[PDB]
Amino acid sequence: IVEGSDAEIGMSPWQVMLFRKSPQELLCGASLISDRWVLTAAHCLLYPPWDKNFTENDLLVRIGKHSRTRYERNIEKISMLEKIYIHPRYNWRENLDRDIALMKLKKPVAFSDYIHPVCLPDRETAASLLQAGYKGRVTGWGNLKEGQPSVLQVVNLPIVERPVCKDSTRIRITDNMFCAGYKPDEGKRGDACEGDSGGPFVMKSPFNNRWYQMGIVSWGEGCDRDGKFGFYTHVFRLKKWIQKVIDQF
């Protein structure tokens, strides 16, 4: 996260950290959507161009973690994966279309003051909140500049018009993504950055006071560059697949 601020404790209890098991290495962000399900970016797990293709066994996840250096003993939880699920039509070859994956926990995690799931958008919450100019919130332990934080970083960024997103890059954008961030005219800055993928882009519903995850940090070009915008996986657009893997046989 570039130009973000330090998260207050318990401010993003659905925050999850995807680590490489051997050796220990923080790979990406993720989010808690249930006691056994963690949502993240497909490319965090599978991306051949970078010689990336992990297996459940290769990784683990940390939750309720407030410090990367210290170990809030009875606060954070470390959970192993039981199965990874990557969207069938994830396009890593071209534009990272459908950059989404689900990770089922070996064992359920216990909710606490520091750990809780974020809500997934329903049809109408999404129809109302997904409007350019409306701000969402992005969190992550990723790069501080195009630089590693000791506290989870957070940044509130406005959703940007599709045409503006499209014209801001040569990469082919799809309906399955959306971009957010300030325009050079706007004054403020801020952006997600390498390392933050998988982390959540959330919005608070005025209707019920609850936080909903509308996007997944997916990609960008550089970080916090004027005229550029960070891209996110459109969670609602991919809700059917999420439910499918979740409710199965």
């Binding site: 809780h116 974020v118 919130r137 509130n156 608070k204 936080w211």
Partner: peptide, 26 residues
């Protein structure tokens, strides 16, 4: 049990920047 934070919503307490979010809805 989702979208509601024990140290915040459950306590009827706002974090420091969420009003920035609700204001953007205008």
């Amino acid at each position: 049990d989702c979208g509601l934070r024990p140290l915040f919503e459950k306590k009827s307490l706002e974090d420091k920047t969420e009003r920035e979010l609700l204001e953007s809805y205008i």
